[PDB]
Design an enzyme around this catalytic site. Structure first.
Site, PDB file in Angstrom:
ATOM      1  N   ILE A 141      -3.553  -5.050  -8.814  1.00 56.31           N
ATOM      2  CA  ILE A 141      -3.474  -5.462  -7.409  1.00 56.31           C
ATOM      3  C   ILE A 141      -3.992  -4.338  -6.527  1.00 56.31           C
ATOM      4  O   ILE A 141      -4.872  -4.547  -5.683  1.00 56.31           O
ATOM      5  CB  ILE A 141      -2.037  -5.854  -6.986  1.00 56.31           C
ATOM      6  N   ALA A 153      -1.342   6.688  -3.442  1.00 55.78           N
ATOM      7  CA  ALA A 153      -1.356   8.143  -3.680  1.00 55.78           C
ATOM      8  C   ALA A 153      -0.691   8.552  -4.978  1.00 55.78           C
ATOM      9  O   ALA A 153      -1.137   9.503  -5.608  1.00 55.78           O
ATOM     10  CB  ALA A 153      -0.663   8.874  -2.538  1.00 55.78           C
ATOM     11  N   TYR A 154       0.412   7.896  -5.349  1.00 56.24           N
ATOM     12  CA  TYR A 154       1.146   8.275  -6.569  1.00 56.24           C
ATOM     13  C   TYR A 154       1.653   7.101  -7.391  1.00 56.24           C
ATOM     14  O   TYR A 154       2.689   7.180  -8.021  1.00 56.24           O
ATOM     15  CB  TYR A 154       2.292   9.237  -6.238  1.00 56.24           C
ATOM     16  N   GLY A 155       0.894   6.026  -7.464  1.00 55.23           N
ATOM     17  CA  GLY A 155       1.382   4.884  -8.247  1.00 55.23           C
ATOM     18  C   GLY A 155       0.426   3.739  -8.170  1.00 55.23           C
ATOM     19  O   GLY A 155      -0.649   3.869  -7.561  1.00 55.23           O
ATOM     20  N   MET A 156       0.824   2.614  -8.752  1.00 53.40           N
ATOM     21  CA  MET A 156      -0.068   1.474  -8.891  1.00 53.40           C
ATOM     22  C   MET A 156       0.710   0.173  -8.957  1.00 53.40           C
ATOM     23  O   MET A 156       1.786   0.096  -9.539  1.00 53.40           O
ATOM     24  CB  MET A 156      -0.968   1.632 -10.139  1.00 53.40           C
ATOM     25  N   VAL A 157       0.116  -0.869  -8.395  1.00 49.97           N
ATOM     26  CA  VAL A 157       0.730  -2.183  -8.434  1.00 49.97           C
ATOM     27  C   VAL A 157      -0.137  -3.173  -9.211  1.00 49.97           C
ATOM     28  O   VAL A 157      -1.350  -3.323  -8.933  1.00 49.97           O
ATOM     29  CB  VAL A 157       0.994  -2.737  -7.016  1.00 49.97           C
ATOM     30  N   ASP A 206       5.078   1.425   9.021  1.00 51.11           N
ATOM     31  CA  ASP A 206       3.712   1.092   8.686  1.00 51.11           C
ATOM     32  C   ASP A 206       3.430  -0.403   8.637  1.00 51.11           C
ATOM     33  O   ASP A 206       2.835  -0.876   7.703  1.00 51.11           O
ATOM     34  CB  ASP A 206       3.324   1.719   7.348  1.00 51.11           C
ATOM     35  N   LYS A 244       5.507  -2.302  -9.265  1.00 54.74           N
ATOM     36  CA  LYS A 244       5.020  -1.049  -8.737  1.00 54.74           C
ATOM     37  C   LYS A 244       5.448   0.095  -9.626  1.00 54.74           C
ATOM     38  O   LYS A 244       6.617   0.439  -9.667  1.00 54.74           O
ATOM     39  CB  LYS A 244       5.568  -0.822  -7.336  1.00 54.74           C
TER      40      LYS A 244
HETATM   41  C1  LIG Z   1       6.337  -4.558  -6.584  1.00 56.55           C
HETATM   42  C2  LIG Z   1       6.809  -3.956  -5.415  1.00 56.55           C
HETATM   43  C3  LIG Z   1       7.809  -2.997  -5.532  1.00 56.55           C
HETATM   44  C4  LIG Z   1       8.302  -2.353  -4.424  1.00 56.55           C
HETATM   45  C5  LIG Z   1       7.800  -2.631  -3.155  1.00 56.55           C
HETATM   46  N1  LIG Z   1       8.400  -1.961  -2.129  1.00 56.55           N
HETATM   47  C6  LIG Z   1       8.488  -2.445  -0.821  1.00 56.55           C
HETATM   48  O1  LIG Z   1       7.911  -3.463  -0.470  1.00 56.55           O
HETATM   49  C7  LIG Z   1       9.218  -1.720   0.162  1.00 56.55           C
HETATM   50  C8  LIG Z   1       9.452  -0.328   0.098  1.00 56.55           C
HETATM   51  C9  LIG Z   1      10.171   0.341   1.104  1.00 56.55           C
HETATM   52  C10 LIG Z   1      10.689  -0.343   2.218  1.00 56.55           C
HETATM   53  C11 LIG Z   1      10.489  -1.709   2.324  1.00 56.55           C
HETATM   54  C12 LIG Z   1      10.991  -2.443   3.483  1.00 56.55           C
HETATM   55  F1  LIG Z   1      10.011  -3.228   3.917  1.00 56.55           F
HETATM   56  F2  LIG Z   1      11.378  -1.655   4.509  1.00 56.55           F
HETATM   57  F3  LIG Z   1      11.960  -3.140   3.264  1.00 56.55           F
HETATM   58  C13 LIG Z   1       9.756  -2.357   1.310  1.00 56.55           C
HETATM   59  C14 LIG Z   1       6.798  -3.601  -3.068  1.00 56.55           C
HETATM   60  C15 LIG Z   1       6.282  -4.281  -4.162  1.00 56.55           C
HETATM   61  C16 LIG Z   1       5.243  -5.223  -4.054  1.00 56.55           C
HETATM   62  C17 LIG Z   1       3.938  -4.759  -3.812  1.00 56.55           C
HETATM   63  C18 LIG Z   1       2.859  -5.636  -3.731  1.00 56.55           C
HETATM   64  C19 LIG Z   1       3.047  -7.012  -3.868  1.00 56.55           C
HETATM   65  N2  LIG Z   1       2.007  -7.882  -3.779  1.00 56.55           N
HETATM   66  C20 LIG Z   1       2.214  -9.217  -3.923  1.00 56.55           C
HETATM   67  N3  LIG Z   1       1.240 -10.081  -3.846  1.00 56.55           N
HETATM   68  C21 LIG Z   1      -0.128  -9.628  -3.673  1.00 56.55           C
HETATM   69  C22 LIG Z   1      -0.607  -9.525  -2.242  1.00 56.55           C
HETATM   70  C23 LIG Z   1      -1.080 -10.666  -3.134  1.00 56.55           C
HETATM   71  N4  LIG Z   1       3.432  -9.723  -4.164  1.00 56.55           N
HETATM   72  C24 LIG Z   1       4.524  -8.858  -4.261  1.00 56.55           C
HETATM   73  C25 LIG Z   1       4.346  -7.480  -4.103  1.00 56.55           C
HETATM   74  C26 LIG Z   1       5.432  -6.606  -4.191  1.00 56.55           C
END
Ligand SMILES: Cc1ccc(NC(=O)c2cccc(C(F)(F)F)c2)cc1-c1ccc2nc(NC3CC3)ncc2c1
EC number: 2.7.11.24
Length: 335
Positions: A21, A25-29, A139, A44
Site C-alpha cells: 500500500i 520513514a520507519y515502516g510499511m503498510v 496531520d 502496518k
Molecule cells: C494498518 C494500520 C495500522 C495503524 C494505523 N494507525 C492509525 O491510523 C492511527 C495512528 C495514530 C493516531 C490515529 C488517530 F487517527 F488519531 F486516531 C490513527 C493505520 C493503519 C492503516 C493504514 C492504511 C490503511 N489503508 C487502508 N486502505 C487503503 C487506502 C486504500 N485501509 C486501512 C488502513 C489502515
C-alpha cells in the site's frame, strides 16, 4: 518469508497474501488476508527502536489505538511482535482494510454537495471524539480519510512520511497546515486540526488543494490572497514576533469572498468553511460548534456523537521499548 518492496513482513501464518500500500520513514503498510477471522486487513509494520522519536510516536500510536473505538476512526484488530523483548525489533499493527480514500476519490470525481456534506459530517464526528480525549490529530489531509463503497469515512494517521527528495499519495505535504504552525514553533492547539478540515472542505468544493505552494511563504501568500491581510487583531495573535514582523512587511491583499471562489457551492457550506479557515486560531470554530452548524443539520445528532470516556492528560528509546512491550502484551497468545 513474505517480502514486499524489500521489507520482510513476519506476519504468517495467520496473515498471508501481502500486497503493498505504501511506506513511511520507519515502516510499511500492506494489505493481507486474516485466516483466523476471514477478513481483508491492512497491516502496518514499524521498526522504530533505533530512534527515540520513532519510539515516542510508536508508543503514542499504540496507546491512542488501544483506547479509541469509534465508527469514524480506523480501529485496531491485533498487534504482532516477538515473545521476547530482546527479540522484538518490528511491531505490526493490524486494522480492517478500507477500499479507498478521499485523496483517490478526489482525482476521479467532482463530488456532489450531498457527498461533501456527509463526508464532512463524519470527519467532524470522528474529530469530536479525538478532541474530547484531548488528543490532536496534527496531520489531517485527504490521504488520511478512508472510504468504502457506501460512503463510510474513517480517520487515519498513516504515520511519518518517507524523506522527500528535493506527486504520490503518502508524502509529507504542508498544504493543510495551519498558519500558526508555519509562523510559530509549537504552541499548537485543537484549532490546527479545524484549519486542516477547512482545507479539506475547500478541496472537496473544487478540483484542487486550496493552499498549495513550494514553500511556506508561497502558501502564506495564497492564504493572504484569499483571506486578505491580517487585521491588527490577527497580527497580535501571532506569538512569534519574528514571524509577526514578516507578515507586517507584506503588501496589503484584499479579501476574496468565498462565493467568488466557489460560485456554485452551497452557501451554508461556505459559511462553515469561512469559520474553519479563520486566521486567528482563537476565533476559529471548534469541533462541536461545527457539528451544530446549519450545513450539517441533516445528520447532526449529539446523542449519537460519542465523546471519549478515557481522556489523556523525555524518555530514552530503551525505556520506550519497555513501555511498548508492556502495552502490546495484551495481544500475546499466553494472556
Ligand atoms: C494498518 C494500520 C495500522 C495503524 C494505523 N494507525 C492509525 O491510523 C492511527 C495512528 C495514530 C493516531 C490515529 C488517530 F487517527 F488519531 F486516531 C490513527 C493505520 C493503519 C492503516 C493504514 C492504511 C490503511 N489503508 C487502508 N486502505 C487503503 C487506502 C486504500 N485501509 C486501512 C488502513 C489502515
Amino acid at each position: 518469508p513474505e517480502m514486499v518492496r524489500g521489507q520482510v513482513f513476519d506476519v504468517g501464518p495467520r496473515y498471508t497474501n501481502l500486497s503493498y500500500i505504501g511506506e513511511g520513514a520507519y515502516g510499511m503498510v500492506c494489505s493481507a488476508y486474516d485466516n483466523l477471522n476471514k477478513v481483508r486487513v491492512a497491516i502496518k509494520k514499524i521498526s522504530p527502536f533505533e530512534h527515540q522519536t520513532y519510539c515516542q510516536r510508536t508508543l503514542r500510536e499504540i496507546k491512542i489505538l488501544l483506547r479509541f473505538r469509534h465508527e469514524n476512526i480506523i480501529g485496531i484488530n491485533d498487534i504482532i511482535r516477538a515473545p521476547t523483548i530482546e527479540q522484538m525489533k518490528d511491531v505490526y499493527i493490524v486494522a480492517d482494510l478500507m477500499e479507498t480514500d478521499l485523496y483517490k476519490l478526489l482525482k476521479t470525481q467532482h463530488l456532489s454537495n450531498d457527498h461533501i456534506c456527509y463526508f464532512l459530517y463524519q470527519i467532524l464526528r470522528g474529530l469530536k471524539y479525538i478532541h474530547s480525549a484531548n488528543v490532536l490529530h496534527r496531520d489531517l489531509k485527504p490521504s488520511n480519510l478512508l472510504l468504502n463503497t457506501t460512503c463510510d469515512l474513517k480517520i487515519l494517521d498513516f504515520g511519518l512520511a518517507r524523506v522527500a527528495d528535493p506527486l504520490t499519495e503518502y508524502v509529507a505535504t504542508r498544504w493543510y497546515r495551519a498558519p500558526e504552525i508555519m509562523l510559530n514553533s509549537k504552541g499548537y492547539t485543537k484549532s490546527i486540526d479545524i484549519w486542516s478540515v477547512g482545507c479539506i472542505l475547500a478541496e472537496m468544493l473544487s478540483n484542487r488543494p486550496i493552499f498549495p505552494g513550494k514553500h511556506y511563504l508561497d502558501q502564506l501568500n495564497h492564504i493572504l490572497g484569499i483571506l486578505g491581510s491580517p487585521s491588527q487583531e490577527d497580527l497580535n495573535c501571532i506569538i512569534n514576533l519574528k514571524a509577526r514582523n514578516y507578515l507586517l512587511s507584506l503588501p496589503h491583499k484584499n479579501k476574496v469572498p468565498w462565493n467568488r471562489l466557489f460560485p456554485n457551492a452551497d452557501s451554508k457550506a461556505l459559511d462553515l468553511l469561512d469559520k474553519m479557515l479563520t486566521f486567528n486560531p482563537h476565533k476559529r470554530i471548534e469541533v462541536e460548534q461545527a457539528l451544530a452548524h446549519p450545513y450539517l443539520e441533516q445528520y447532526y445528532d449529539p446523542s449519537d456523537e460519542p465523546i471519549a470516556e478515557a481522556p489523556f492528560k523525555d524518555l530514552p528509546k530503551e525505556k520506550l521499548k519497555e513501555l511498548i512491550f508492556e502495552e502490546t502484551a495484551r495481544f500475546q497468545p499466553g494472556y
